[model samples]
Target: SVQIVYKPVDLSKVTSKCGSLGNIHHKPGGGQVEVKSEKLDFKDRVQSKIGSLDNITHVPGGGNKKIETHKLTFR
Candidate 1:
């Protein structure tokens, strides 16, 4: 028998400060998830936006930066 537990962190606060500049949006996953036995692979959804190139602003990358969550695995 195997036990699986899901825990989430404060993504809103974390993304607001760091992700806002990069035009990144972060949304929390389902309320809670459970798993029993078997192998599990986790994936996260990400969204990004880029401004028009015509803009006179100069950015090193010339595009909006974004943040992503790392994948998780359980055995």
Candidate 2:
């Protein structure tokens, strides 16, 4: 058996109302008015791994180097 426990934290309050027009259940008047108010608890985890950078190449001040430039004139 596996069980998960979630911690409580301060969450944003969301309030919404669902409106239904027309007749429902073969009856007259408005269909049905429903109100839902609840809080959602989200839980997540980060899994990471570190590897060797043997095959990696490093260049210093590479951002300031411009490889090529081009100009075009349109009619």
Candidate 3:
């Protein structure tokens, strides 16, 4: 799993962001995703990933999935 480093840091403010690599093509065994951008806004970055993941069946509920029964309680 990709690590999420949540520490009150807003990722959008990084100013050194790389969006998805390039094209989104369908393959017999899932195609490669390519994004083009030196710097990207949050939604744009996520969009590219979602497009690629939507068709697959085995992957974990990808593309615009909302989580429920989750809490971020700080003590």
Candidate 4:
């Protein structure tokens, strides 16, 4: 069960949060073989510390800060 709001946040924030796992997944389109880089491939460590694909679109941004609003949920 999860009720999380990815709220209108900065892509840089997500990028910072995601950092780099330093390891790569060899399989094509396959996820990182570690939980450290989970959460829709954003590596959302906070939410990842806990949750797909859907029409809550857009990862776009501009003018110094990359920002966008997207919705995500888990149950």
Candidate 5:
């Protein structure tokens, strides 16, 4: 289940409570292997012990101190 929120807030303040997961899935455009960096739920998901897709779970400045600086990473 999921809920949609049109309201906006500081994404940096929000932490990815969800764990990290990597995978290659087919794109809607075609059968293409697309590597995704998801954070389950940006506002209310579970938290990852190690962190996730640019999510600032436990950083001093929340990492994303500003826009365009979310610093999301994966392998």
Candidate 6:
């Protein structure tokens, strides 16, 4: 048996404050994620958007899902 666990964070606030990083894609195989940011304050802004219970969500996934639950949270 196999199980996966993941956490997600919001980026609209990040991009609105720190700008965007161009095209983005998801490769959800394991339970993790990757982010992009060139601005110095990008990470700084993201710090406040951490995955706490207040901003956390749970989605159901079966097979190849666009909302892969683990792929991207704000997609």
Q: How many clashes would you count in candidate 3?
A: 5
Worst lDDT run of 10 residues, candidate 6, spans 59-68
Q: What lDDT tens digits, residue by residue, belong to model 1 across residues 1-75?
A: 887666767555322223334654545443544445465455678553332223233434334556767677975
Candidate 4, run of 10 with poorest lDDT: 48-57
lDDT of each: 0.49, 0.43, 0.48, 0.42, 0.44, 0.42
lDDT of 6 by residue, 1-75 (tens): 655565466553212233544555544444554556555455453646433323333432322333324343431
What is the full ranking by TM-score, best candidate first?
1, 3, 6, 5, 2, 4
User: Candidates 1 and 4: which is better by TM-score?
Assistant: 1
Question: Model 5 over residues 13-48: C-alpha lDDT tens digits?
Answer: 545443444453533433334356554454666665
Q: Candidate 2 residues 1-75, lDDT tens each? A: 655555445554544444544343333343444555475455688553333223323433323443334444444
C-alpha lDDT of residue 56 in model 2: 29
TM-score of each: 0.24, 0.15, 0.20, 0.14, 0.16, 0.17
lDDT of 3 by residue, 1-75 (tens): 455565554344213334654565556665577766677567543634533535643432223444335456554
- Between prediction 3 and prediction 6, the one with superior lDDT is 3
Angstrom error of the Cα, residue 51, model 1: value is 26
Q: What overall lDDT, based on C-alpha atoms, would model 1 receive against the true structure?
A: 0.49
Mind giving the per-residue lDDT tens digits that candidate 4 earns over 1-75? 645555464445423344444544343453333334443445454553321322333333332465455656555
Predicted structure 5: clash tally: 6
Off by over 4 Å in 6: 1-30, 42-47, 50-75
**In model 3, which residue pairs have backbone atoms overlapping below 3 Å?**
20-35, 21-34, 21-35, 22-34, 22-35
Top TM-score model: 1
Q: Using lDDT as the measure, name the better of candidate 1 and candidate 6.
A: 1
Model 3 scores a TM of 0.20
